[PDB]
Amino acid sequence: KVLTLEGDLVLGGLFPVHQKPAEDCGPVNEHRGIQRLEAMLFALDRINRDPHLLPGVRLGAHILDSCSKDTHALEQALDFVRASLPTAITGVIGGSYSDVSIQVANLLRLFQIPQISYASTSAKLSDKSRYDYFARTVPPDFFQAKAMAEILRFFNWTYVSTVASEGDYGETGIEAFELEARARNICVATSEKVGRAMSRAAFEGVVRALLQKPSARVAVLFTRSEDARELLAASQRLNASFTWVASDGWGALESVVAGSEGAAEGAITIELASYPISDFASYFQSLDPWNNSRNPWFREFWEQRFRCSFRQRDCAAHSLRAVPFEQESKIMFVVNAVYAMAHALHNMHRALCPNTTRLCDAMRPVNGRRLYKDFVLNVKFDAPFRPADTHNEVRFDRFGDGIGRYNIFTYLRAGGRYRYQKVGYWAEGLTLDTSLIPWASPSAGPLPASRCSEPLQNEVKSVQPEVCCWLCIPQPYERLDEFTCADGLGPNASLTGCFELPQEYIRWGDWAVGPVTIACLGALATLFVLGVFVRHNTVVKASGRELCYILLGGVFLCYCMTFIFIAKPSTAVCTLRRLGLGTAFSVCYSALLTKTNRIARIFFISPASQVAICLALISGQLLIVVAWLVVEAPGTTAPEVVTLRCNHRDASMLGSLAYNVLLIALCTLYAFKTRKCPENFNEAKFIGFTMYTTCIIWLAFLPIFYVTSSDYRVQTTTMCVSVSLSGSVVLGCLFAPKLHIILF
């Protein structure tokens, strides 16, 4: 059957009056069908009574039934399309389920008929390429993903788990939430799926999968009513508690929390926002079958509601005023849709018809394209029958979807008698009032946290073996990158680079003061001795007289080594020191060897031969020294400062000292031959004393050298003062008696 009301313009409608075997239509749906249909009739009466909207033209209706099946609705829409070619349908206000809306839109876009849908929220319907002529007064479903992502973010939760149901509702929402969470820098731990028919142990499987990765105590649900009920029951069985964030499927229903109330504490849920229409209740309460003849489906609804038959005349007793009335959620959207179409036609009248209250001949056919593209999509008005305080308004976004307002709820521990409570809303951004949720005002510890890793540069932010998680791992000694550590001989404050440590060295400003002073004193004394020696080259000529000058020269050479020693270490400096000690020591002892050899030589011997022998020994020691260092080419860090040192070892220096010791031993034996032989003021005793003194000095120095080689700050000083003391000892033991005798 059809419902018809004559008028100048007729608005079609499509409602799910009967539910879904051989038959195509079953029992009557009370809440969704009859209440919404009567709401549409209420709106049409109120608009025709209003003297500002459509003063002249009267609106009619042509309402059909959908029977909750796409095939039946598509079959019935042929009536509208055929009438488009007795009464011409201006528009269609219908579509309760997503699929019926899809089919009717695909059929009607060809013949250019507008459509406004009051309760279709599928996300596939915003693609205006396929559905050119669609409008709706309810927001699309994917806004809930944005709202839930914002709610999660504002509480600082990063590690989350998601559960979705099979079908379009759970799926499309789940990819929407994933896309938004990726943008908001939120990482999803695991993603599950719940089927239509699933056993209790199979639900234990899902909750066990959720418990597989602990430390995630926030579970996002995008589920229908029955699936959520089973999931909460399964959570009750296994004594597992989380903090749940849900879509409008959970909503504020009481059935989903029934017999498993213990787990449902602290859930945050989102629901569509609505207010009661005061006059609709009064209008609906007074319906009776005898007075209401417009509605063809009122008799069957009354028979089903009051379980009575009309043939026996036993139905007159019952009345709707006795039973309680709970107004359905989406009546507001039906009234808003009808009013929006009315306002669009009113603007079209004010524009096209210049000065006639009645229907002008310019609109006898009505152009769908211009109406939809210009006037329908540009409607702004205060919502009819709005609450007195509120300021709700109706407006369509460019894509055709309506504006969105949501309510946010939590589950409250009232005394006991637990109940839902309101905590905020979502118009354009989250506007939570935190004082009214029992888990945040008392501040009992930190807010229930779902995060994997906490965020300085001191410890490297190593890549965790989950990609989202970043484990913090501290080189103390040696990092080029944030997660990588770099390395060398000789770390910066910024800790991303390296700063070169100073290269330690013995400086002249330091320990070195005394050696320098004694070196200058000895050098000056040696110069004066050389001068007084050359001055009277006379008592001088008796004892060789040439060994004396080289005797002074060796002492002078020794002094040169003292400055050589304490200097900046380089390859040149290392070569110079590795050579000079051998030359100095060798010459100094060689002179004495030759002198002692000549003493008592008769009991060959000539001025020319002695210098040849001395030069031969000096050259032998020098050649040994050259090979060592020539083999040991020179070059200048600890596992615990960047000291500079020559890599060459000291064993060769020990060998040079050993050759020197052999020389001194030969001197000792020769002086033992003739301890004090008087030839020229009896020098031989002085020679012997010098030999003993050199023996003692070397015996003190070389073992001390080996002992103190460990520490650098002492070793070089000990070496230099030791050698200088040896040289001054040689001077005092050899020259000094001759100095006193010839001086006076």
Give the footprint of a second copy on this chain (CB under 8 A).
74-75, 78, 81-82, 85, 103, 106-107, 110-111, 130, 534-535, 537, 571-572, 576, 606, 608-609, 612, 630, 633
- Residue showing tokens 């110079």: 576
Residue nearer to ligand Z99 on the CB measure, 35 or 621? 35
- CB of 80 closer than 8 Å to CB of 114: no
Out of ligand NAG, ligand Z99, a second copy, none, what residue 315 binds, judged by CB under 5 to 8 A for its kind, is: none
CB of 106 to a second copy, least distance (A): 6
CB of 545 to a second copy, least distance (A): 12
Instruction: Tell me if 155 contacts ligand NAG by CB under 6 A.
Output: yes
Residue nearer to ligand Z99 on the CB measure, 224 or 346? 224
Out of ligand NAG, a second copy, ligand Z99, none, what residue 121 binds, judged by CB under 5 to 8 A for its kind, is: ligand Z99
Out of ligand NAG, ligand Z99, a second copy, none, what residue 156 binds, judged by CB under 5 to 8 A for its kind, is: ligand NAG
Residue 215 marked as a ligand binder: no
Let me know if 119 is exposed, middle or buried by CB neighbors in 10 A (0-12, 13-18, 19+): buried
Residue nearer to a second copy on the CB measure, 60 or 368? 368
Backbone angles phi, psi at 421, to 5 degrees: -140, 155
Distance CA 710, CA 652 (A): 17
Residue nearer to ligand Z99 on the CB measure, 39 or 734? 39
Residue nearer to ligand Z99 on the CB measure, 36 or 349? 36
- Residue showing tokens 């609705």: 73
- Residue showing tokens 């608005």: 11
Instruction: Tell me if 168 contacts ligand Z99 by CB under 6 A.
Output: yes
Let me know if 277 is exposed, middle or buried by CB neighbors in 10 A (0-12, 13-18, 19+): buried
- Chain positions 454 to 513 lying near ligand Z99, rule: CB under 6 A, are none
Residue nearer to ligand Z99 on the CB measure, 121 or 450? 121
Strand partners, 460: 473
CB of 121 to ligand Z99, least distance (A): 4
- 502-531 as b/e: b if 16+ CB within 10 A: eeeebeeeeebeebeebbeebbebbeebbe
CB of 19 to ligand Z99, least distance (A): 12
Q: What is the DSSP-derived secondary structure letter of residue 229?
A: H
CB of 207 to a second copy, least distance (A): 38
Chain-centroid distance, C-alpha 247: 28
Chain-centroid distance, C-alpha 309: 70
Instruction: Tell me if 156 contacts ligand NAG by CB under 6 A.
Output: yes
- CB of 230 closer than 8 Å to CB of 203: yes
Out of ligand NAG, ligand Z99, a second copy, none, what residue 630 binds, judged by CB under 5 to 8 A for its kind, is: a second copy
State the Cα angle at 696 between 693 and 699, rounded to 5°.
145
Out of a second copy, ligand NAG, ligand Z99, none, what residue 122 binds, judged by CB under 5 to 8 A for its kind, is: ligand Z99
Q: Is 537 helix (H, G, I), strand (E, B) or coil?
A: coil
Residue 248 marked as a ligand binder: yes
Out of ligand NAG, a second copy, ligand Z99, none, what residue 169 binds, judged by CB under 5 to 8 A for its kind, is: ligand Z99
Residue 330 marked as a ligand binder: yes
- 86-100 as b/e: b if 16+ CB within 10 A: eeebbbbbbbbbbbb
- Among 642, 302, 623, residue whose Cα is nearest residue 500: 642
Distance CA 171, CA 166 (A): 7
Helix (H) / strand (E) containing 172:
helix 168-183
Residue 98 marked as a ligand binder: yes
Q: Which of 9, 47, 73, 119 binds ligand Z99 (CB under 6 A)?
A: 119
Instruction: Tell me if 136 contacts ligand Z99 by CB under 6 A.
Output: no
The residues, ordered by sequence, that sit 6+ positions from 13 with a Cβ below 8 Å of its Cβ are: 37, 40, 61, 62, 63, 64, 92, 93, 94
Query: Which range touches ligand Z99 (CB under 6 A), out of 92-100, 319-327, 507-515, 733-741?
Result: 92-100
- Chain positions 83 to 142 lying near ligand NAG, rule: CB under 6 A, are none
Distance CA 377, CA 135 (A): 8
Backbone angles phi, psi at 668, to 5 degrees: -65, -45
Out of a second copy, ligand Z99, ligand NAG, none, what residue 96 binds, judged by CB under 5 to 8 A for its kind, is: ligand Z99
Residues that bind ligand NAG (rule: CB under 6 A) add up to a total of 3
Residue nearer to a second copy on the CB measure, 74 or 187? 74
Helix (H) / strand (E) containing 59:
strand 59-65
Residue 36 marked as a ligand binder: yes
Distance CA 158, CA 218 (A): 9
Instruction: Tell me if 224 contacts ligand Z99 by CB under 6 A.
Output: yes
Binding mask 16-55 for ligand Z99 (x = CB under 6 A): ----------------x-----------------------
Instruction: Tell me if 121 contacts ligand Z99 by CB under 6 A.
Output: yes
Query: Shortest Cβ contact with ligand NAG: which residue?
Result: 156
CB of 447 to ligand NAG, least distance (A): 6
Residue nearer to a second copy on the CB measure, 106 or 475? 106
Q: Is 361 helix (H, G, I), strand (E, B) or coil?
A: helix
Residue nearer to ligand Z99 on the CB measure, 97 or 411? 97
Backbone angles phi, psi at 215, to 5 degrees: 75, 5
Distance CA 517, CA 474 (A): 52
| Cα-only R_g, the chain | 55
Residue nearer to ligand Z99 on the CB measure, 96 or 726? 96
Instruction: Tell me if 503 contacts ligand NAG by CB under 6 A.
Output: no
State the Cα angle at 342 between 337 and 345, rounded to 5°.
130
Query: Which range touches ligand Z99 (CB under 6 A), out of 114-122, 238-246, 272-280, 565-573?
Result: 114-122
Instruction: Tell me if 484 contacts ligand NAG by CB under 6 A.
Output: no
Strand partners, 60: 10
- CB of 303 closer than 8 Å to CB of 310: yes
- Chain positions 442 to 471 lying near ligand NAG, rule: CB under 6 A, are 447
Strand partners, 159: 187
CB of 113 to a second copy, least distance (A): 13
Out of ligand NAG, ligand Z99, a second copy, none, what residue 576 binds, judged by CB under 5 to 8 A for its kind, is: a second copy
Out of a second copy, ligand NAG, ligand Z99, none, what residue 106 binds, judged by CB under 5 to 8 A for its kind, is: a second copy
Out of ligand NAG, ligand Z99, a second copy, none, what residue 168 binds, judged by CB under 5 to 8 A for its kind, is: ligand Z99
Residue nearer to a second copy on the CB measure, 65 or 227? 65
- CB of 122 closer than 8 Å to CB of 98: yes
Out of a second copy, ligand Z99, ligand NAG, none, what residue 28 binds, judged by CB under 5 to 8 A for its kind, is: none
Residue nearer to ligand NAG on the CB measure, 158 or 724? 158
Out of a second copy, ligand Z99, ligand NAG, none, what residue 119 binds, judged by CB under 5 to 8 A for its kind, is: ligand Z99
The residues, ordered by sequence, that sit 6+ positions from 730 with a Cβ below 8 Å of its Cβ are: 551, 554, 555, 558, 588, 690, 693, 694
Pairing of strands 268-272, 406-412: antiparallel
Binding stretches for ligand NAG (CB under 6 A): 155-156, 447
Annotated binding site for L-glutamate: 32, 36, 98, 119, 121, 248, 330
Rule CB under 6 A: which residues touch ligand Z99? 32, 96-98, 119-122, 167-169, 224, 249
Residue ranges at the known binding site: 32, 36, 98, 119, 121, 248, 330
